[PDB]
Design an enzyme around this catalytic site. Sequence first.
Site, PDB file in Angstrom:
ATOM      1  N   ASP A  10     -22.683 -43.819 -58.503  1.00 36.33           N
ATOM      2  CA  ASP A  10     -23.968 -43.448 -57.909  1.00 36.33           C
ATOM      3  C   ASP A  10     -24.197 -44.578 -56.896  1.00 36.33           C
ATOM      4  O   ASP A  10     -24.409 -45.717 -57.303  1.00 36.33           O
ATOM      5  CB  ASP A  10     -25.092 -43.403 -58.967  1.00 36.33           C
ATOM      6  CG  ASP A  10     -26.528 -43.388 -58.422  1.00 36.33           C
ATOM      7  OD1 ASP A  10     -26.761 -42.774 -57.353  1.00 36.33           O
ATOM      8  OD2 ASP A  10     -27.419 -43.982 -59.073  1.00 36.33           O
ATOM      9  N   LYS A  71     -27.498 -47.232 -46.593  1.00 38.49           N
ATOM     10  CA  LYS A  71     -27.485 -45.779 -46.814  1.00 38.49           C
ATOM     11  C   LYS A  71     -28.407 -45.027 -45.825  1.00 38.49           C
ATOM     12  O   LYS A  71     -28.159 -43.855 -45.533  1.00 38.49           O
ATOM     13  CB  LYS A  71     -27.860 -45.488 -48.270  1.00 38.49           C
ATOM     14  CG  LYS A  71     -27.668 -44.050 -48.720  1.00 38.49           C
ATOM     15  CD  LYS A  71     -27.985 -43.955 -50.178  1.00 38.49           C
ATOM     16  CE  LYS A  71     -27.765 -42.593 -50.719  1.00 38.49           C
ATOM     17  NZ  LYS A  71     -27.988 -42.553 -52.195  1.00 38.49           N
ATOM     18  N   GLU A 175     -26.223 -35.718 -55.530  1.00 39.89           N
ATOM     19  CA  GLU A 175     -26.943 -36.424 -56.574  1.00 39.89           C
ATOM     20  C   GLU A 175     -27.630 -35.458 -57.551  1.00 39.89           C
ATOM     21  O   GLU A 175     -27.353 -35.595 -58.736  1.00 39.89           O
ATOM     22  CB  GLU A 175     -27.909 -37.459 -55.953  1.00 39.89           C
ATOM     23  CG  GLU A 175     -27.172 -38.681 -55.423  1.00 39.89           C
ATOM     24  CD  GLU A 175     -27.897 -39.554 -54.416  1.00 39.89           C
ATOM     25  OE1 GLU A 175     -29.142 -39.472 -54.335  1.00 39.89           O
ATOM     26  OE2 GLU A 175     -27.216 -40.331 -53.711  1.00 39.89           O
ATOM     27  N   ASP A 199     -36.526 -36.826 -58.508  1.00 43.25           N
ATOM     28  CA  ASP A 199     -35.863 -38.110 -58.294  1.00 43.25           C
ATOM     29  C   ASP A 199     -36.747 -39.162 -57.573  1.00 43.25           C
ATOM     30  O   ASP A 199     -36.771 -39.236 -56.337  1.00 43.25           O
ATOM     31  CB  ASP A 199     -34.532 -37.895 -57.524  1.00 43.25           C
ATOM     32  CG  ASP A 199     -33.649 -39.123 -57.375  1.00 43.25           C
ATOM     33  OD1 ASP A 199     -34.000 -40.186 -57.942  1.00 43.25           O
ATOM     34  OD2 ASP A 199     -32.593 -39.020 -56.700  1.00 43.25           O
TER      35      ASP A 199
END
Length: 385
Positions: A10, A71, A175, A199
């Site tokens: 992850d 990211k 994800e 999330d």
Amino acid sequence: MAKAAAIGIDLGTTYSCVGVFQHGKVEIIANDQGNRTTPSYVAFTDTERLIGDAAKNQVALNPQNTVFDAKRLIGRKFGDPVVQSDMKHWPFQVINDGDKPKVQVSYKGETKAFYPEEISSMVLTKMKEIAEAYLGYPVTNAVITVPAYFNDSQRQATKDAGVIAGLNVLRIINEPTAAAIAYGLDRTGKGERNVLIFDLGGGTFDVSILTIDDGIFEVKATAGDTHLGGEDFDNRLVNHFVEEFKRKHKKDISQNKRAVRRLRTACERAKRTLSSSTQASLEIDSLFEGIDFYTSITRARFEELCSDLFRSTLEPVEKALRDAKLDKAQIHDLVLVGGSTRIPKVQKLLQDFFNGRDLNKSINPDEAVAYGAAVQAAILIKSTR
Ligand SMILES: Nc1ncnc2c1nc(Cl)n2[C@@H]1O[C@H](CO)[C@@H](O)[C@H]1O
């Protein structure tokens, strides 16, 4: 041996996690400091390159040469308005190399520039070395996760980070798909299953709606806030304590960078205590001008301080439901992802919005994605033989 072994990674915005599926169970691998999650930070110093916890721990003393949020830059063009807007908030330099962003730093006394994929490859190398130290042999096969809204360019730059890191990337998976795999939501037999993944991480909020039809995953909707996470709740605690210090001592600490940072790290710790206790204590020796700051806060006050932020998480849930053209009662499963979903008020708000429904939260929410990626990596490596 190693060729029949595969890991699940992850690769998160603020934190990364690595898991391995062996002997019928997932093991979320702890780093050398014993933490099951590692900060996605890379520090460049006068003598070395630091990755993870060691990089995060010296961020205050070296902010211009400590890279994070790679990211947010990966697979993007320098001219992209997302890049241009984010650049105004980072203490490190971002430069343009042929419409591609590079992070420019001082390393061992020299000016060096890195592509976001080279930064992410250093985080991936660390995750690979954490797995190798746990297993006793080098593991190279990996499943790496990405947000469901990542386009082809962002997926390709993530796979490139994996190649630079020395990993054989078996698959780039979403994800929310890894999270639904963690809960075994793709093994309920026949009939379409509607799953909502909530999330809430350190710096981003993502809502995803998936349909799982006979093992096949389909993303129906994605919604959220790329600038909402756990760090906004810490800052709300910080502001409260700066105002409390002003009322008790008639002194403004806001301009003292060191005082604010020590208060910020203590607030983050206090916030985590508030997920399992109805009160938390702050114990900061000599916070400002030799004054100790020994105070406490209830969960009720913390909930008031973040009330508007917690309530704002329900607008993307509604938005994702309308985009997916589904009513609440059509959602079969609700999955919690990210450390911030441990907050009791967040859980109560989501459960009340879904009319008193049970939430899937038995897997550590900051580890659910790596857990599912590790399950997928084991299935994929077995099929490869
Ligand atoms: N027990 C907890 N109660 C509240 N927030 C938590 C908790 N654990 C983590 Cl991690 N976070 C936060 O999750 C993010 C990483 O996913 C960070 O913002 C961390 O503070």
